[PDB]
Structure 1
């Protein structure tokens, strides 16, 4: 079946706009959103306003925020023609300019980087508009005494990918991103550790299992950006040619750097593991499929895992790695999400989309009405439409209740849309083909 990818891209970008924290521009397209968290600051009063709220909450979780940005940037680089065909290319640049600017703010000095604003427990205890928050919002950083090679190298990857994206429109901005990428990557190498041990507030939410894959990923991005041999050396030092990724996601960069190195750097040693990942996902592999055709990796965000795999498959296809099966697989997954199994899983799009995403700001009625946990519990649709949000998804039998309190299936998050959006742009690009 066919879907309007131009509309999907427009809406996915609007989802990210609805996640913006800080001082919103005059041209803000999300009418229920206003200025919020203007007090966000470091421990010496450094400005930390901006960035994205992670999910349906108001925490700024730097690790997924950075990974979502690296992934979105990669899709812009590879599938620029799809974004352009859709009229969404400059809106996509404006989308990630938001988080790139936040990463610059968070990098307060060479070897201090702010990785979280908001205490997840006090943040999640509040249900209401971000514009109405009154609780203390602590900020935490990584440093030599409290390292985070994973967070620092992921942010370096986002900044290096950002340099590549932006050097074609705002070269001064792009080259500033590159300078910070180099510095953060050096910090990551010099001060080894797991960021969610150093910023332990993150450990119940975005716990990092290992940092070596982020070291390889940051090096691969900096090699693409600079072509300096020392970065390729670092990629080989930290990268695996013998292990196959379970997922491409905010925690596990393995197939990301393997594919990036094979395609952008021409390093075929990593190619067999890319093929293993793809074939694990394709029908007949290790990932179970629901009866209606979703490749269902796990209970949490199966749409996210499949959309991420579809993204990796479409980058692979672009570079003529298993292109036929990759395109077929990716299209099957994205089209599942768009409506092939009977409903859209994208809020505000297509047939019978979810109306109750687990999301605070869209759950609240129009100002000046009050908003509290009653709006969590109320049995009807969210008062605002969270256009473009890809929800967590159905269970393994394609069941979905569309209940706000079903926080697993009705979850929305920055990382959920990041592979998805690039995959949609890739499918839009494929439509440009002769014939």
Structure 2
């Protein structure tokens, strides 16, 4: 157990230019002297702290330490509080350099390669022999999928809506999280996010840079003439098209999309995808999945249109089919199912799809320019909307943030604000203004927080921090990036600097929530393969993977036993492999993590 330093910093470091604020846990009501020293112990800067009081989310008494003006590049800087009476009167060492995020952005995206179903994970792409593994779910005994996956047994207590009996080849796609399920909802926002960072880069003339170019990523498709990040996105998109119901399968719902596919029952940690012995089944279609599908294939179609016209035309054709089917079946919801004794995959339930309809309409209008989509989106209650705090999926009501896997209207709005389209110039300006307005609210949240994070406690019942609290911050930072793009006002960039600092160890746990980075790196994510705590035969996880973070709803036995019930929300976390409610890793959390790290590294250059 590494000591928690009084001076909490970004445990990797800072770009030379930008806001640099540490949070100091300190009982003194008055300012205290601080010193910044280089690796040789020489004082290079000094000042006094700014007493803030008792911080609500952490119940720590804190000061701020602002050293934003310091820009001298160096390795192994550290703070000391010479007059403070404590055994931890310092900070961890950190760097000031331009390449803080240069490798992290690639690590973030490599998560998706590691999570690929339907293909062996091999060197040199795996990045280490210990992360190598056989193909997952290509119908080879242990596995009962995914070449011939039947629809869910209609016998099952939580089977959901009636389905016809047929089978599908649904190989490929990504595993969603620490489990072996593949989900169209959640997969949707994740792949949308990878394609969006690419689209933004192309629009800003950066598609010749980083992961956006052919050969930009350490993947098998790295020399195929296509942008590597689109190759990775395409892996999920190919899976999505397999999930669409055909006329031959069920004429009554043809064009609708299966919500998810996974184990009949939940498996235990300490197993690789190829070892999974569970029967594999298709969950029923959902309107939300169908629309996730329509939105992303529509986006896919405009981005591939010149690289691979055939693939692109097929993406569009299938997307418009999905849209029309959704319109005839607007009320098929993925229902809640219990996590114990039930279907062996997350429910991703949502009983409202007005946002997905708007999102899909946005992507389809920008891709095709057709009136039907324009008319739909302009008459939506979400037209031009960018939430600063959500009111959408029930679970998101009163949650600080702009969008999630199930509250998706903001995704459509981003596309409208970014990509050239035929809406009235003033409407597009409104969307961009709404984005700045939301970002502004979050900048105020940062100033109201001891640990300078852009969320605040949920304004729902239970309050506190929600499951995957870190991903809300990440999605907020995407929109801050857009606010910076549209206004050129560097305060928005500084908001991202504050947010990433929180994620990289300037928090009430002194925890870097990213594997492979920081002095207290994330070591024990909930994952079936990368789980040394289950058995030391299994490997530590690859770097650049972000944990869901603090969740004060006490939603797994491990966190329940590890911390008291009155634990402050920002401390409701444990870096333990069995804590799924506090320490999982996912496609929809690593996707915005990749978005944000690539953005910061681009800013660095």
Note the C-alpha offset of 1:167. 2.5
Give the equivalent residue in structure 2 for 1:332.
498
Q: 1:412 aligns with which of 576, 585, 589?
A: 585
Separation (CA, whole Å) in 1 of partners of 2:124 and 2:586: 20
Give the equivalent residue in structure 1 for 2:298.
160
Q: 1:113 aligns with which of 238, 257, 262?
A: 257
TM-score relative to the length of structure 2 = 0.62
Supply the RMSD in Å over aligned alpha carbons: 3.0
CA contact (8 A) 2:179 2:528 kept: yes
Give the equivalent residue in structure 2 for 1:372.
none
Give the equivalent residue in structure 1 for 2:435.
274
Separation (CA, whole Å) in 2 of partners of 1:61 and 1:163: 21
1:272-314 alpha-carbon deviations (Å, 9 max, x no partner): 54344323322248x973x322334533112111001101221
Higher RCO by CA contacts (8 Å cutoff, separation 6 or greater):
1
Q: 1:36 aligns with which of 114, 133, 136?
A: 136
Give the equivalent residue in structure 1 for 2:546.
390
Give the equivalent residue in structure 1 for 2:466.
299
Q: Which runs of 5+ in 2 are unaligned?
A: 1-13, 16-98, 139-144, 151-165, 214-226, 247-253, 391-400, 457-464, 552-568
Aligned: 1:189 with 2:327: yes
Aligned: 1:78 with 2:200: yes
Separation (CA, whole Å) in 2 of partners of 1:272 and 1:136: 50
Separation (CA, whole Å) in 2 of partners of 1:27 and 1:284: 44
Give the equivalent residue in structure 2 for 1:224.
366
Note the C-alpha offset of 1:26. 6.3
CA contact (8 A) 1:347 1:355 kept: yes
More displaced stretch, 252-261 vs 219-228: 252-261
Q: 1:254 aligns with which of 406, 409, 415?
A: 409
Separation (CA, whole Å) in 2 of partners of 1:401 and 1:140: 32
Q: 1:101 aligns with which of 238, 242, 257?
A: 238
Note the C-alpha offset of 1:394. 4.2
Give the equivalent residue in structure 2 for 1:367.
none
Alpha carbons of 1:398 and 1:83: their partners in 2 closer, same or farther (altered >3 Å)? farther
Separation (CA, whole Å) in 2 of partners of 1:210 and 1:202: 24
Q: Which runs of 5+ in 1 are unaligned?
A: 143-147, 365-374
Note the C-alpha offset of 1:105. 1.3
CA contact (8 A) 1:347 1:354 kept: yes
Separation (CA, whole Å) in 2 of partners of 1:338 and 1:169: 37
Note the C-alpha offset of 1:83. 6.4
Note the C-alpha offset of 1:187. 1.3
Separation (CA, whole Å) in 1 of partners of 2:242 and 2:335: 22
Give the equivalent residue in structure 1 for 2:531.
363
Note the C-alpha offset of 1:180. 1.3
Equivalences for 1:225-240 in 2 at 5 Å?
225-240=367-382
Higher gyration radius (CA): 2
CA contact (8 A) 2:445 2:455 kept: no
Separation (CA, whole Å) in 2 of partners of 1:300 and 1:288: 22
Note the C-alpha offset of 1:196. 0.4
Note the C-alpha offset of 1:125. 4.7
When the two structures are aligned, how many residues end up with a matched partner?
411
More displaced stretch, 81-90 vs 168-177: 81-90
CA contact (8 A) 1:54 1:65 kept: yes
More displaced stretch, 67-76 vs 262-271: 262-271
Separation (CA, whole Å) in 2 of partners of 1:132 and 1:230: 47
Separation (CA, whole Å) in 2 of partners of 1:68 and 1:20: 13
Separation (CA, whole Å) in 2 of partners of 1:112 and 1:54: 21
CA contact (8 A) 1:65 1:99 kept: yes
Query: What secondary structure, in the 3-state scheme, does the structure 2 residue paired with 1:11 have?
Result: helix
